[PDB]
Design a protein around this ligand. Structure first.
Ligand SMILES: Nc1ncnc2c1ncn2[C@@H]1O[C@H](COP(=O)(O)OP(=O)(O)O)[C@@H](O)[C@H]1O
Ligand SMILES: Nc1ncnc2c1ncn2[C@@H]1O[C@H](COP(=O)(O)OP(=O)(O)O)[C@@H](O)[C@H]1O
Ligand SMILES: Nc1ncnc2c1ncn2[C@@H]1O[C@H](COP(=O)(O)OP(=O)(O)O)[C@@H](O)[C@H]1O
Ligand SMILES: [Mg+2]
Ligand SMILES: [Mg+2]
Ligand SMILES: [Mg+2]
Lengths: 505, 505, 505
């Protein structure tokens, strides 16, 4: 391999790479702007050791005393239905509300799994609110305590706009202790000094400072039955999410997945890339027709098309190739269907007729031939009707309107096309036509599908295959040439079709 | 090797890979959803050392005192007959029952092996129950103690639905101590502090907490004749089984075993893959007939079949190959039986007869020939009867009904087929037929099995072998060609049969 | 590869390398001369340990006491609108001013983000000043305190020229402590001694010394409720930016990016470099025309041009190549447009006419031919009008004024150029002209674009291609030669055009 090839492949697939990288970067930006910020508060205490004090601070007694003091077993969560509602509310500048609950007691269903009872509180005004646990609706008022339906609740100082909802959960004490212990860290920072740094992370910058102050005070009171140097304060810059590293990771991930996909697609290509691939085997490529981005003939609708220019190049190439041929019959065929045989044949006939030579076009695709549709037709009396014997040699020839050449349609689809094409009346037709016309072009089905082309090619002076640019492979074209030679038909060469411009070439 | 080949092999064997991986993932999911959950309880004590205390806690004195206190020597197990009954009961939400037994004394058979006596208790109601040890049925009532048949039992507070069964075992004290010590761990967690973490795992989240509390209290009482900071609590999330890692391991195991099986099958393939394998040796492959997924002729029942199209391709190839041959006799043969010789020969005769040429078909498989069954027959007067001399040249020829060609059946199976085929009357028959027909096709047995084909091939102008797609190998076909040439028979080429579409090609 | 090639490439691209390196060095010099200088002050104290004292010095209590003492929470910044205004002011020798503020209290909006209120103070004279916070204009006087609009301010000892502006921010206490702690360092320097080195970096050489003295005094007073050996002094040489290393890094970065760009451009070149590239394939290069840096003929305006000398070399080469040719017709063509076909053909005709031979020039570029513009024209009756039949063979020939040869213009642009060129009247014209002139030169469109050149080349005795020096590639020229040979036209050789002098050759 070489650098030029890889750079060309990257240039060709630029749209895919850009789209994938942009999608990944957009997802990264959305996550980094919608993820909830996490603040960190710190405190510094002095040990008058410090190896067992790390375990004493994280023991369930200290944390449990803190949780009992601060009522951390009442989980209040602002209610947003979607997974991005909270982030959108924060971005729009909306101020989150809060409720001070000093007493909560749910009926404690305590089944096998749901060990955490929860209710939903809807704020109707600054004073009253509605409560629903499992569809049971109740009404409560700030101030006076509520003892109804096995539910006890005391709510103070609602701070939210009316219509807001809050999920109130009474999680078990061990769950609260585990959650507190997950986000709480103790370090020595000197490995020998009495200095201990206590760290607590959480999404509420004031609550975490209060929690760490309570932890420190409880530990201090417990020890004297240690010195608090730095009481806990919260860093106003969140520690998570780290937006810049997230976005950089997203961009690099997009680039690497795009490069992997591009390499995978490049290594899985088998189609023909250039005429030199065919010419390595020993197949003369007589032309390369580009894609015409422009039920009518292109050589007639848009005579100045680039594809028609390539076809004129093919015409002047054939005027020299088709010399010293046994007759004036040219047979266009191919390996696979929808390669361009009818396009090539019809347009070539048009470009050769505009130069003043009489041209006959025969649609010998007795199976899926649509030439009569493209030329303007009387569908009666096609090639089939002549071959089966129910027509004459003069009632099957029609004239293209915007063309300048005659044509013979397929006719009705027969049940035995390959056996009709073997009748000697076909050779009689070709011998008769080879005296009233200057050129005869025959369109045929593929050869890798059926055998009609190989029957027709016996009476053809020149035979050319059509290879589609990306679809067909060199193996298919070689197999087709060999199958034609096995049946006694000499293929003059190939015609690459549907070519497009690639920066890797 | 190259990446395209391996990707193609993976695409071809996709069904096998998917099935194996799905089976493994289903087994992993069943195990991860039916395995009994194992909870873990923890405690934290303070050592006022700690290297000998780990051995003192795990000594048999502390554990034995705990087991005597909590009666851990009475093993009560809920009875489910299958190995998945307990998991199903847990999944369906069924609440396990329990019995508080404060005194159990079994007769203690104490033979060589069964040192653990056991009984089965069936719950009939909230009060009474039935007991069976070795077929001896007894009835007991909660409350009043039972002393019968050398069995002492005191049962309190049955909690289960009627009809439940419980296995009650009186395991030896050392066995109970060993079981307790297997699931009990002590750690320092600081390597220098007085802090010891005690861990106990078990399937009953309350019993393990009680057991660890008893262990801690016994150690504390023993030492003062240490401080308990964190009394034991149980983590409600089970530590085993870890479902996600189990499922990931199952999926990866399925993928690796599937890839290994695929590679093993690929490396053990010897059959013909493409016509190019035969053409490397120098054997002209004249056709490749695909599998016809559609006692009748295919070229007649379904004339538009893909296989009949391939046979028409072979027909037009033969019309050119069979020129400049010494006569109009074609001999289809093969290497191994059930390769397609009769299929190819009969269908080829049909496709050549539909074009208006007189065709004779001869079934020279005098050993296992079934052509007369496929054509509609009068089984008398076949080839055998003519060769042995008990028939004429005109009483053996019959006509295929839906065909269009004549045929000669094998006749009765003779005892000496290879010696009948050497009679000059066979050559007389062929010389006579070569003047009344346009083509003669002869079907023969394989050549690697018997020698009839090599006797017949002396009088055949053209001879073609049939190679089955996956079954035969290049070695078999080369051996067959060489064995034909050794006997003076020139094989024109080969016919690949039963071809299917493979993404690795 | 070899050293000579790389040295030549470096010599050829010297201007690009010099420009890039100079730009990078200029940017580095601008940064190193405009970046604000950062001074460093040091102190040395003695510890009578020293592992916890590093944490005690950086604790928020000591730094907070210092900040409360020195009022470091009032941030005063000199106002320069651009990002280089301060550096320019320092370079021009301007003395920065300062204000001593002993009391500041802003309304403290304290919204979600802007936690730091700020005002702008404009100095009108040595006594009074103007204040604007959010468009609210106020006037204040040094001395008397200001308590207006929720803003309290006390300003003493303004030292600046009138018209200067100062941003006054009241940043939060924790922000001030964090900023102080970011630039403050403590080290032991012996790892065992009581000697501690305290370091403080800042842009004001006196303020940092005062700050470090206050830090040391506060720590000393705190400890005795330690010895100060070296009170803080400021190194007058700034520690940042380090100009020399910055400039060296800039120069080396410029050199490496220039070398990378040069290597990238060299590896992405595909055009023809020397005639030997064409002669490897087997194409005879008959000349190499250099660029003429000098609507007129070069061989006439500047007959002593270097390009005209190369064309005379081509003329004497052709006088030997064009012997034993079937006629006296020469056809200049090419692969891509704007290669030099009309330049080469017209100048060659001029140089061959100055030697006394009758020369005919034909502009057979019926699509974009501008020869009549370059020769002085009567645009009527060109080649088109003759071919279409509406003109005679004598009304189309005109005479070049400063030339010496006749010419035929294209005429009006036709709709069917390629089909006009196929008329036998073109061959009649050439046969008639081949008897009244000594040489006929025909200019043609490219061959990779259209097919006109291949139609004309049938009647041309000699055909030469023109390859542009850097534009065309060897692949294009080979494709053109092969496409000419496919149509029955033998190309004698090639002509390299637009050559320039490269030190890598
Ligand atoms: N270079 C081309 N540019 C534009 N359209 C093309 C080109 N080649 C083929 N086609 C069009 O795509 C369709 C398939 O080609 P067609 O020749 O009709 O199939 P087949 O090769 O089986 O006879 C046709 O409608 C054709 O007009
Ligand atoms: N390409 C094929 N498609 C469908 N059936 C086939 C094909 N080739 C052979 N068979 C069928 O499978 C059976 C075995 O083939 P057969 O020719 O009868 O055996 P043998 O080669 O020994 O004479 C037959 O019943 C045949 O009809
Ligand atoms: N060696 C050259 N020196 C100076 N000018 C040149 C040279 N070669 C071509 N040109 C000029 O650059 C332009 C493009 O060349 P031209 O021959 O007219 O295009 P084309 O090859 O398509 O006919 C012209 O104006 C030509 O005069
Ligand atoms: Mg078609
Ligand atoms: Mg058989
Ligand atoms: Mg030009």
């Amino acid at each position: 391999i070489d650098l030029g090839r890889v750079i060309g492949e990257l240039i060709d697939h630029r749209k895919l790479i850009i789209s994938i990288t942009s999608v990944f970067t957009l997802f990264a930006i959305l996550y980094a702007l919608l993820a909830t910020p996490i603040y960190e508060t710190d405190a510094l205490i002095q040990i008058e050791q410090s190896a067992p004090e790390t375990a004493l601070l994280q023991s369930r007694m200290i944390l449990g005393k803190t949780i009992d003091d601060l009522n951390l077993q009442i989980q209040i969560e602002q209610k947003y239905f979607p997974v991005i509602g909270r982030g959108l509310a924060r971005l729009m500048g909306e101020k989150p509300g809060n409720i001070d609950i000093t007493r909560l007691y749910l009926p404690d269903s305590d089944d096998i799994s749901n060990n955490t009872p929860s209710i939903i509180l809807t704020v109707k005004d600054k004073e009253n609110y509605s409560i629903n646990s499992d569809g049971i609706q109740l009404n409560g008022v700030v101030g006076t305590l509520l003892n109804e339906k096995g539910i006890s609740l005391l709510v103070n100082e609602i701070d939210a706009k009316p219509g807001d909802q809050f999920v109130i959960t009474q999680l078990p004490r061990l769950k609260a202790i585990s959650d507190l212990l997950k986000s709480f860290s103790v370090a020595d920072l000197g490995k020998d000094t009495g200095m201990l740094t206590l760290t607590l992370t959480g999404d509420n910058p004031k609550r975490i400072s209060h929690i760490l102050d309570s932890i420190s005070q409880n530990y201090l009171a417990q020890n004297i039955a240690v010195r608090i140097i730095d009481n806990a304060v919260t860093d106003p810059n969140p520690v998570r999410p780290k937006k810049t590293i997230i976005i950089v990771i997203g961009v690099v991930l997009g680039l690497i997945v795009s490069v992997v996909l591009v390499l995978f697609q490049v290594f899985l290509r088998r189609g023909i890339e250039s005429p030199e691939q065919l010419e390595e085997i020993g197949i003369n490529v007589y032309a390369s027709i580009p894609i015409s981005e422009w039920d009518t003939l292109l050589a007639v609708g848009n005579p100045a098309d680039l594809a028609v220019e390539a076809i004129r190049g093919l015409r002047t190439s054939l005027h020299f190739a088709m010399m010293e041929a046994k007759n004036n019959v040219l047979m266009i065929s191919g390996a696979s269907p929808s390669a361009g045989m009818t396009f090539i044949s019809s347009n070539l006939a048009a470009t050769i007729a505009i130069t003043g030579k009489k041209v006959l076009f025969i649609d010998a695709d007795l199976r899926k031939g649509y030439a009569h549709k493209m030329f303007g037709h009387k569908n009666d009396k096609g090639l089939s009707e002549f071959l089966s014997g129910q027509a004459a040699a003069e009632m099957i020839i029609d004239k293209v309107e915007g063309g300048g050449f005659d044509y013979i349609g397929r006719g009705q689809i027969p049940p035995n096309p390959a056996e009709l094409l073997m009748h000697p009346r076909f050779e009689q037709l070709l011998n008769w036509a080879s005296q009233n016309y200057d050129l005869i072009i025959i369109d045929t089905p593929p050869i890798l599908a059926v055998t009609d082309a190989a029957i027709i090619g016996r009476y053809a002076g020149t035979c050319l295959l059509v290879a589609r640019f990306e679809k067909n492979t060199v193996k298919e074209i070689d197999v087709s040439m060999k199958r034609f030679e096995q049946s006694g038909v000499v293929v003059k060469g190939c015609i690459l079709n549907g070519v497009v411009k690639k920066a890797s070439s």
